[PDB]
């Protein structure tokens, strides 16, 4: 059920963050990002990034894709979470149900000391018995489609191969 979704991510939430602040963060922060990378998508994720050349792209294109685009979203968010990891987490107790109600949207509220609460809202969809996120919000800025421009920009001129050799190229 929909209420599901709120659970999950209420037990992922607590989840990391009682990873980050029980251990040395040198393989703290490791075992935070393993812990969390099978509960989303980067499939659709990179979908979501890329816009509408995805659908055009191979297979073999999209995987490509999707591999080097978790591993910028890891390296770009990772220390991220470490600094924040003393968050208070509130989930809204109800989620927003979209597409037909195959897409489950959980709000969360997000407190770090010393600042505003933020939203953080969780795009998720049912798989299996688990619930895995596709969209990441924050203060309703996509985490995630503020890539659209620029890979947008790189795709007219090099391409879909074009833009899986830069994204290779970034991540080192
Ligand atoms: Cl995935
Ligand atoms: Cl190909
Ligand atoms: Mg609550």
Do not use: H
């Not at 073999?60 to 080097?68: D, F, R, V, Y």
């Not at 107790?93 to 109600?101: L, Y």
């Not at 489609?145 to 833009?163: H, P, S």
């Amino acid at each position: 059920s929909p209420a599901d979704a709120v659970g999950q991510i209420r037990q992922n939430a607590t989840q990391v963050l009682t990873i980050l602040k029980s251990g040395d963060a040198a393989s703290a922060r490791p075992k935070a990002e393993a812990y969390a990378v099978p509960y989303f998508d980067f499939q659709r994720m990179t979908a979501l990034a890329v816009g509408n050349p995805w659908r055009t792209a191979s297979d073999a294109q999209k995987q490509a894709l999707a591999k080097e685009f978790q591993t910028l979203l890891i390296r770009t968010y990772s220390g991220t979470m470490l600094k924040f990891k003393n968050a208070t987490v509130n989930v809204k107790d109800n989620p927003i149900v979209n597409k037909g109600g195959k897409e489950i949207v959980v709000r969360a509220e997000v407190g770090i000391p010393g600042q505003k609460p933020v939203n953080m809202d969780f795009t998720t969809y049912q798989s299996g018995g688990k619930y895995r996120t596709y969209n990441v919000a924050i203060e309703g800025t996509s985490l995630v489609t503020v890539y659209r421009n620029q890979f947008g920009e790189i795709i007219k001129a090099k391409g879909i191969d074009g833009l899986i050799a830069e994204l290779k190229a970034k991540n080192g």
